Amino acid sequence: SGVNNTKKWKMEFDTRERWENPLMGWSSTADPLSNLVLTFSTKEDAVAFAEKNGWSFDVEERKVPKPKSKSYGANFSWNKRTRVSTK
């Protein structure tokens, strides 16, 4: 339930082939840009680092949890169906 991991913009590269070794069988790969994840404090800085390094990008806007009005007294409401049956 913590939110301390949703405060910095991340840059990541699309995944690629990941086969299994003929030996014991780890997850091999041939794409060096597989574990590269970069962190940026603002979208503009992040979107600027992409084409400056020359990388086609797509950007998804930050999802802000909308404020929700919560009242404890609603748990026991005279009329409204929000009255709970257990506590």
Binding site: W78, N79, R81, S85
Partner: protein, 45 residues
């Protein structure tokens, strides 16, 4: 009719029954005025 302070006249509780409380509650229902209505039939309905 004295100041019979030496007698515990509250003995009616001795000859009570299992259903006594709910019995005279039922007999007492007719005196009660209609209850308020919260609208819906249930908090879930």
């Amino acid at each position: 009719e004295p100041f019979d302070n030496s007698t515990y006249r509250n003995l009616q509780h001795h000859e009570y029954s299992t259903y006594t409380f709910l019995d005279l509650n039922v007999e007492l229902s007719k005196f009660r005025m209609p209850q308020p209505s919260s609208g819906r039939q249930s908090p879930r309905h």
